[PDB]
Amino acid sequence: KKITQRKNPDPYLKKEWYPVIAPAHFKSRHIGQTPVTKTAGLRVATDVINHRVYEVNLGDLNPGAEDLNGNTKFYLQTQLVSDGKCLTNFHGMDITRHKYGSLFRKGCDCIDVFMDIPTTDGYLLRVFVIAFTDRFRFQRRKNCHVKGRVIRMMRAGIYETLHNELGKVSIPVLVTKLSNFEVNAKLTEALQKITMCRDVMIRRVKVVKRPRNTMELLSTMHDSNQVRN
Amino acid sequence: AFAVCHIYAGKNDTFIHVTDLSGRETIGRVSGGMKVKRHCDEPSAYAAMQATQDLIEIITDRGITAVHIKIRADGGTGKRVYGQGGSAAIRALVRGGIKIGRIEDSTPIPTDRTRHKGGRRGRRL
Amino acid sequence: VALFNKWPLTDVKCQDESLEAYISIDNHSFVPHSAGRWSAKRFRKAKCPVVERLTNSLMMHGRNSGKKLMAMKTVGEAFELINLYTGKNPVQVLVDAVANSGPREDSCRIGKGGQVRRQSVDVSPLRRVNIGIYNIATGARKAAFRKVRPFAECLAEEIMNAAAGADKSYAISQRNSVERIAVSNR
Amino acid sequence: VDYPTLFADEAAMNEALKFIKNSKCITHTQICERLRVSVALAKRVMRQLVKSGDFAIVSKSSRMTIFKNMTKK
Amino acid sequence: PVKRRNNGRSKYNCGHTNIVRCQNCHRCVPKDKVIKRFTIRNIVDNTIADDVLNACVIQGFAIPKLYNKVQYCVSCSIHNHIVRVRSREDRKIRTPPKRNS
Amino acid sequence: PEPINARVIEVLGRTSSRGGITQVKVEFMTGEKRQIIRNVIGPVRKDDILVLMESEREARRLR
């Protein structure tokens, strides 16, 4: 935050910096500062910063637990500019590229499922999940490959865990479920009965559709700290 | 003062640009090519070293005490290896005193890619 | 012990830390005519007396090959001219003249396949000591050639002009030119 | 070209000497370059300065001879 | 005659196989013929990795390591020394030289 | 910036296809202290303690 206080370059000779705050579930709410050109003919600065998208790491969002879920990131889009502070809603999550690559290995079978879920709220989201097979302890052979019956059963299983987990829950409940990694955990326990599995994690979850004016949803997401539930 | 610096490395030229976390507003931009007259020297780390030094003065003036690093090659249907200036890009910022936040690959990798220039016989050089 | 038993040899010192070990005034002894196996091993020439190497580069171009006697006498006549104008030890000015005249930067091919680009390189302190002594020696010769000024007066001024750092000295300008080329292809 | 070579100084004897003295140390060819005179001429001029006690021979050789004024202040 | 009994291609019970591309040549080679190496290496140069890690404000942030697969064509590999022309007896060995990094 | 006197810790070896260039590991004498491989020229032994104008333009190890 430099131009509003004092001298900075020709573009930033008339610019402002506005605090950006993330949802209540995250341990460190402040995300950072946004550079924005000062108010102009039709370009009101607050209207300009209404729909900016930030990419936050879960380690940055919930610090002190960096070693776990250092890979997991959350894309958050401002919906309100109240108090001079941008209030953001969850718009996407993805595992980091360095991790995505470490997930694949030769002699393993990869199961990726995409399941769009209509939430208990207005938002519609597609949950992209990934699972891999792992060597059983005895393993006379060197390849973690399974017959089709395990592949179908396991993929049917993945859809079922999402069906009774993320299928009918609202966005604040989803944010807690993807942050504590709870739903990722459920698929593994179900998969563990089905087969020897590794890396059963929801890799990406994208906002396919947004109910217009989720201002009420941004009150619950941002200031319902009291209703942590 | 966290911000994100996207560093195109690729080949042919190196682009070092620091931006807002949103990416909507660019705090600063510099290119390896601007520094060197010869076209071949543009991807080289010496050109890049002089290049990120120039950017540091502009960015630190505009706050930006801390930056996050996203580095990408040509990507898409080309190379997928950062190439020359990418290694210098973090190093020169470290000489400057900008603080690293998190490092990542921004390669535009393609699932099921479109065809690439060259032909079946390939570049017969 | 004094150089040529005329100009007092005192504790002449080196201002460079790089050219300190490779420039030697401790073993300076009357008349730099000592017959030594200095061109032996690979690093023996380091312990050479500073004036002796400067004297050796004076018998050059084939015209004076082997004439150390004349070269010492020219070193001697130059040493006095420097002593008269600057009013101090020539052996101290000669040390400053060599350290300043040595190009600091060099460039080299690096043998990068076909490319012959002269990528910049660092210099050996010893190599610097030689180039500086060589630049002072070949500059002094260019200044004379078909000129009224004879070599002794040219050699003295060249050391005196190299010591300050003046661009006029061939020794300084060679240092400057080489390092300007070295940054250009760094 | 410093062509004159027969004690050429006529009214510039003093001038040549003021120049010679202005230099704390001189050489035969330094005279010839600084002024317009031949080095052979300088050899005979230098003599009437050494003998008078104006300049002192610091170093002597058939080739290079170096002279420095005793005082001049 | 038959220089290689595998005919240069790990193609068994296939008839036809998928096509791939030389990274530098951009040639088209059958997947079986392609050299196929898997390289896992640090995102930053390993020489600068320690300083970058110390400068990294994040606690216990491991340096990310790039994971990529490089596939070259026979002609492309021989020039880049990915694989070396070998003697007739040495061709029969199928084990990696000096023991995937 | 200003050239920094550095100190050779080991002679990595000659390179350049003419052996003209010998690589040396150098450590900056003034505080700092950083082990970086730098291309040199000429006759160089150990503890030559050379001084370089470039400073941070370090060069790759011989391959």
**Domain ranges within chain A, ordered by starting residue:** 13-225
> What residues of chain A lie within 8 A of the CB of E64, using their CB?
96-98
Which of C55, C49, C57 lies closest to C25, judged by CA?
C49
State whether residue A77 sits within 8 Å of chain B by CB: no
Q: Scanning the structure block, which residue is given the tokens 């100190």?
A: F7
Residues of chain B positioned with their CB less than 8 A from the CB of E24: 123
Hey, are the CB atoms on B107 and A97 less than 8 Å from each other? Answer: yes
**Quick one: which of C55, C68, C43, C62 has its CA closest to C98?**
C55
Indicate the pairing of strand A86-95 with strand A30-37: unpaired
Give the residue from E44, E58, E70, E82 with the most B CB atoms within 10 Å of its CB, the best one to mutate: E44
Rounded Cα distance, D36 and D3, in Å? 7
What one-character-per-residue DSSP string does C96-153 give? HHHHHHS-SEEEE-TT-TT----EEEE--HHHHHHHHHHHHHHHHHHHSSSSSS-HHH
**Cα gap F25→F11, rounded to integer Å:** 7
E56 among annotated binding-site residues: no
Burial C151-178 (b: 16+ CB within 10 A, else e): bbbbbbbbbbbbbeeeeebbbbbbbeeb
Tokens for A15, please give them. 């610019």
Give residue for tokens 């090659």: B73
The pair phi, psi for residue E73, each rounded to 5°, is -95, 165
Instruction: Give the residue from chain D lying closest to C148, CA to CA.
Output: D29
Q: Tell me the helices (H) and strands (E) count for chain D, helix number first.
A: 3, 3
Q: Enumerate chain D positions whose Cβ falls within 8 A of a Cβ in C.
A: 2, 24-25, 27, 29-30, 32-33, 39, 58-59, 61, 63-64, 66, 68
Tell me how the structure was determined.
cryo-EM
CA angle E23, E26, E28 (to 5 degrees): 110
Measured CA to CA, the distance from residue E35 to residue E71 in angstroms comes to 6
Q: Which positions 117-176 of C are in contact with D (Cβ < 8 Å)? A: 148-150, 152-153
Query: Position of tokens 């890009």?
Result: B89
Which among A22, A46, A45 is positioned nearest to A32, based on CA atoms? Answer: A22
**Does A96 contact chain B (CB < 8 Å)?**
yes
Contact (CB<8Å) F56/B95: yes
Domain extents in chain E: 1-96
Which residues in chain E belong to E strands, given as ranges?
A: 19-21, 28-30, 37-42, 65-70
HSE value, Cβ hemisphere, 13 Å, CA-based, for E16: 2
**Hey, which residues does E68 pair with through a beta bridge?**
E39
Amino acid at F27: E
Out of E43, E60, E67, closest to residue A102 by CB = E67
CA distance D25 to D72: 11
Kindly calculate the radius of gyration of chain E based on its CA atoms and give it in whole angstroms: 19
Chain C from 44 to 103: CB within 8 A of any F CB? none
CA separation for the pair F7, C18 (Å, rounded): 10
Q: Where does B20-111 have alpha helices with state H?
A: 32-35, 45-61, 85-96
In the block, tokens 């006029």 appear at C168
For residue B22, the chain A residue with the least C-alpha distance is A54
- Give the C-alpha distances (Å, rounded to integers) separating D22 from C152, D31, D55: 22, 11, 12
